[PDB]
Structure formats: C-alpha cells, structure tokens
Amino acid sequence: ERFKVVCYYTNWAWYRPDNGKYTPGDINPELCTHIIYAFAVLDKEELVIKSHDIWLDVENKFYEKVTALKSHGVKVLLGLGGWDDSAGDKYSRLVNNVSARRKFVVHAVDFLEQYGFDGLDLDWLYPKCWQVECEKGPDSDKQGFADLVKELRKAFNRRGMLLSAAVSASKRVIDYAYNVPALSMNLDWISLMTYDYHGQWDKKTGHVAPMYVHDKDTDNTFNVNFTVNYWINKGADRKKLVVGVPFYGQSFSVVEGAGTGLGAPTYAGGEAGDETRARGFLSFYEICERVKVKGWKVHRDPGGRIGPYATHDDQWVSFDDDFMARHKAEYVRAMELGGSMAWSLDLDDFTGKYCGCGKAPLLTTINHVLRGKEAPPPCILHE
Ligand SMILES: *[C@@H]1O[C@H](CO)[C@@H](O[C@@H]2O[C@H](CO)[C@@H](O[C@H]3O[C@H](CO)[C@@H](O)[C@H](O[C@H]4O[C@H](CO)[C@@H](O)[C@H](O)[C@@H]4O[C@H]4O[C@H](CO)[C@@H](O)[C@H](O)[C@@H]4O[C@H]4O[C@H](CO)[C@@H](O)[C@H](O)[C@@H]4O)[C@@H]3O)[C@H](O)[C@H]2NC(C)=O)[C@H](O)[C@H]1NC(C)=O
Ligand SMILES: CC(=O)N[C@@H]1[C@@H](O)[C@H](O[C@@H]2O[C@H](CO)[C@@H](O[C@@H]3O[C@H](CO)[C@@H](O[C@@H]4O[C@H](CO)[C@@H](O[C@@H]5O[C@H](CO)[C@@H](O)[C@H](O)[C@H]5NC(C)=O)[C@H](O)[C@H]4NC(C)=O)[C@H](O)[C@H]3NC(C)=O)[C@H](O)[C@H]2NC(C)=O)[C@@H](CO)O[C@H]1O
C-alpha cells in the first residue's frame, strides 16, 4: 500500500513464438498493485482513444480479461500512446485545442468505463519533443498537456478513476515537456521511464539504465539517480514518483577490434532474439538463454553504478539483472518514492524456464523489496 508496483502488460506479446507468448492468463496479480494495458492509440482524425488491436482487445476480450483482475485487488488502467503511436502531431493538435481536449475527456471516461478500466495512463512520448525530437513541437505543448491532465483529473475525480503518466528520463526533454509541479499535483503517480539512456542510436556500447554516474560517462545526467533527483528538484512529490526498471537489454554489434568495453563503437543493433524478433534489444529471458546455453560472458561493474552487460563475438547487450533490480527497488524505499514500474511483464523470465530463478524473477525481486514478499536470493547469472 505504501509502495506501488506498476506493471505494464503489452497486448502484442500475444503475437510471439510459444515460448515468449504472454496472454492475460499469464499475469500473476499478486505481483502488481497496478496493471497498465499497453497500448491504446489516439485516432488521428477524431483525437479520441481507440483500440490499436480490435481483434485482441475487443473481439478476444483481452481488455476485459485484464480488467477482470481487479477482483484480486489490482487496479487496472489503460495506457494511451507509447513510442510508436507518439509519431506526428496528433497529440499536440489535441492538447493545443480546447474543443478537442473537452471532447477527448468526455469520450475517454466512457471508453474506460465500457471495458472496466479503473483509469488512464498517459504515454505521449513526448510533449513538445515528439519522439525525442525537441525541435518539432510548439513550446505550448507543455501547457496543453498540463491542461489536459488537469481537465482529466477533475473529470476522473467525480468517477473514482486513476490518472497517471509515463514520462521521459532525459533532463532536456523534461525541461521542454513537463510542468513538473502541475503534473505531480494532478497525477496519482508519475512513471519515470528511467531506461533507454543508451542504445544503438548512440553508436557506442552503453548501459540501458545506469543507476549512478560512471566515470566513462560523457553526460552525468544519463542515469536513474539524476532523473529522480531532478524531478524532485523541479518540484515533484516524492510519493508520486515511480521508478521504471527495464526487463530487457539494449543490444549492439561492435566494430571489429574495438573490444568489449563500455563506449566501444558499434555499427548496428545486435542480432534479433528468437522471441522478441527485434534487432537492438533482447528480453531478459533471451539474455539468460545466451548466458546459460550459449556461453555469453557477463561483465559487471564493481562500483555498482551500472547493471551488467553480456558479450559473445561482436554482440553486446546491457541489462539489469536481479541484483540491480533489487538495488533500484531498495533505492525507491530508501528515497521514500512512490514505487517501481516494470516494462514489461512479458520480457521478464515469467515462465521461469530460462533463467532458473523461479517464475518472474525480476518482478518477484521488486515485490520482495517494496511489498515484503518472501523470496529467494538474487539469481547469479554467471552461474
Ligand atoms: C545521487 O544523486 C544525488 C543528487 O545529486 C547525489 O547527491 C550528493 O550526495 C552526496 C552524499 O554523499 C552529498 O555529499 C555531501 O553531503 C553532505 C552535505 O551536507 C556533506 O556532509 C558531505 O560531506 C562528507 O563527504 C565528503 C565527501 O564527498 C567529505 O569530504 C566530507 O568531509 C564529509 O565526509 C564525511 O563523510 C564521508 C562519507 O561517509 C566520510 O568518508 C568522511 O570520512 C566523513 O566522515 C565523517 O563524518 C560523517 C558526517 O559528516 C560521519 O557520519 C562519518 O561517520 C565520519 O564521522 C558531502 O559533501 C552531495 O552534496 C550531493 N550532491 C548534490 C549536488 O546534491 C548522490 O551522490 C548520488 N548518489 C550516488 C550513490 O552517486
Ligand atoms: C538522432 C539521434 O541520435 N537522436 C538522439 C536520441 O536518439 C537520443 O534519445 C534517445 O532516443 C531514444 C529513441 O531514439 C529514446 O528511446 C525511446 O525511449 C522511450 C523511453 O522514454 C521508449 O519508450 C517506452 O519504453 C518502452 C521500451 O523501449 C517502449 O516499448 C516499445 O514499444 C513500442 C511500441 O510503442 C514497441 O514497438 C517496442 O517493441 C517496445 N520496445 C520494447 C523494448 O518493448 C514503450 O513504448 C515506452 N513505454 C511507455 C510506457 O510509453 C522507446 O521505446 C524508445 N524508443 C526507441 C526507438 O528505442 C530514448 O529515450 C532517448 N534517450 C534519452 C535519454 O532521452 C538522445 C539522447 O542522446 O540523443 C539524440 O541525439
């Protein structure tokens, strides 16, 4: 009750080879206080919420099958947006027009109630910095988003619905996008997306979610600790801040002869995993498979500032393991924040067959720290 564990469920994890396949029946409600159903999308024409996958969400009742878990004491919200749906100006057009916001709020309330959702989690990435491009949006996206949140807050309070938002971890995006005091006041929690600080786009090996500054770092703001303290210094309520932990790694293909170190030049994303089928990232269970069966070498930071990374040939993937996930959850408790967020349920070793540290090892670890679930010690991968 004191700490939230916000779990992102992704509907497209259904369209995955049997061993990676994740359905609403795979959710363990004991491991979440709040489930976010990712994603719904904004209709480009009407600027209202709509299903991104009618066949799954509606025809096969995946919306209702997830909101049905509220009988376990879990709150279930619909996530609107995500990275891919945040392309273009549709959300900016929405928040900069008073008539469109008003029609969005009225429709959103009934859309959510029609499927039994307890609320809405805003995942516009990002106000003003459309898909991280801060030159694209107007400076007024900041107030428009703030005003959309205020108007949703007042409309939701009369219905008992929850309102939250997933937000960037980048200092520069925060400055352009977020009225931090207004958002903290009007949102039930703020999910800091404290990951994807580094990836194939840097063209150098880096860690997906550094905890503290590392000496090889070029920028001392690209770490979880800065993001949290920055939101606090910008005026945020500690108890509203929810620290996101990635259940997946950023993978790279390193230029030949550049070594296996941090900051080694890369020419492409890593080879795709069998289940996630996406160059540039691997699920946690795919990383376990590579360490246990394929002999990938785990490299750790003795200073505890970043999680591990794994290597084989010119492949390189940085990720959070059980030890770093425990630390980030312990960091939330030590800092008295709102809780932890998991992206995403399906990228954890939810079956337990890959990592051999029980079912949902990463999520179990977080629940152990924040909610007192007795658990085994962290699993050592190298073993
Ligand atoms: C996450 O991001 C945060 C936000 O930016 C980072 O914030 C920084 O946090 C550090 C905390 O470590 C803070 O540092 C100052 O904290 C207080 C400010 O009021 C000062 O007292 C601190 O001085 C101590 O540390 C200095 C070294 O930096 C040292 O020179 C100074 O003399 C004093 O040393 C004592 O404590 C050391 C640490 O244990 C001992 O090694 C040393 O021997 C001294 O010990 C004696 O005194 C203690 C009481 O003072 C006593 O308890 C002890 O037992 C012994 O008797 C320090 O300057 C920064 O201000 C803060 N930065 C900002 C910008 O806010 C945070 O670091 C980051 N986390 C991580 C993990 O990276
Ligand atoms: C030109 C140039 O070099 N520009 C750089 C710029 O690239 C650097 O900024 C970094 O940009 C990357 C994008 O290029 C940013 O990465 C974003 O990060 C988002 C986090 O805020 C992340 O979205 C959330 O997290 C999930 C995990 O990635 C997302 O899941 C993804 O969902 C998709 C559907 O929408 C799906 O298709 C994907 O498969 C899925 N991926 C996984 C692993 O599951 C999720 O959508 C989203 N969650 C929520 C709740 O909304 C984006 O996914 C990610 N995109 C990409 C393309 O990777 C990164 O944040 C930027 N870094 C920083 C620190 O700001 C910038 C920094 O240097 O430098 C510019 O020069």
202 CA from centroid of ligand 2 (Å): 12
For residue 229, which atom of ligand 1 is closest to its CA? 4
Terminal alpha carbon distance of the chain? 35
For residue 182, what is the DSSP state? H
Position of tokens 């600080």?
197
Asked if residues 352 and 364 have their Cβ atoms less than 8 Å apart, the reply is no
The answer to whether the CB of 329 falls within 8 A of the CB of 365 is yes
Strand 75-81 relative to strand 49-51, pairing: unpaired
Say if residues 118 and 58 touch (Cβ distance below 8 Å). no
225 lines ligand 1 (CB under 6 A): yes
Q: Is 237 left (phi over 0), alpha (psi -120 to 50) or beta?
A: beta
Q: Kindly provide the b/e burial profile for residues 25-58, where b requires at least 16 CB atoms within 10 angstroms of the residue's own CB.
A: ebbbbebbbbbbbbbbbbeeeebbbebbbeebbe
Distance CA 312, CA 102 (A): 53
Q: Say how far apart CA 374 and CA 162 lie, in whole Å.
A: 29
Q: Is 318 in the pocket of ligand 1 (CB under 6 A)?
A: no
CA of 212 to the centre of ligand 1 (A): 15
C-beta of residue 37 within 8 angstroms of C-beta of residue 45 = no
Residue 152 carries which side chain, given as an amino acid letter? L
Q: How was this structure determined?
A: X-ray
Note whether residue 33 is domain-resident: yes
Q: Is residue 290 in some structural domain?
A: no
Q: Residue 96 corresponds to which tokens in the numbers above? A: 């900069």
At 84, list the tokens.
């891919």
Q: Flag whether 300 is in a domain.
A: no
Between CA 131 and CA 268 the distance in angstroms is 20
CATH number at residue 223: 3.20.20.80
User: Within 13 A of 238's CA, how many CA atoms are on the CB side?
Assistant: 10
What is the distance in A from the centroid of ligand 1 to the CA of 327? 19
Look up residue 80 and give its two tokens: 């609107």
Domain membership flag for residue 314? no
Residue 270 lies in a domain: no
Which 8-state DSSP code applies to residue 41?
E
Cα dihedral 200/206/212/215 (nearest 10): -140
In a domain, 299, yes or no: no
3-state secondary structure of 273: coil
Instruction: Say if ligand 1 is within 6 A of residue 223 CB.
Output: no
Could you check whether the bond before residue 15 is cis, i.e. omega within 30 degrees of 0? no
**C-alpha span between 27 and 36 (Å, rounded):** 12
Q: How far apart are CA 291 and CA 278, in angstroms?
A: 19
Within a domain: residue 146?
Answer: yes
Residue 291 falls within a domain, yes or no? no
Q: In Å, how far from its chain's centre is CA 370?
A: 18
Instruction: Using DSSP bridges, classify how beta strands 189-192 and 162-167 pair: parallel, antiparallel or unpaired.
Output: parallel
Nearest CA to ligand 2 atom 5: 201
What's the structural domain count of the chain?
1
**Atom 48 (ligand 2): residue with closest C-alpha?**
82
Domain range for 59: 4-246+320-371
The H-or-E segment that residue 267 falls in is strand 266-269
As a whole number of angstroms, the distance between CA 217 and CA 300 comes to: 16
Q: In terms of DSSP bridges, do strands 248-254 and 119-124 run parallel, antiparallel, or are they unpaired?
A: unpaired
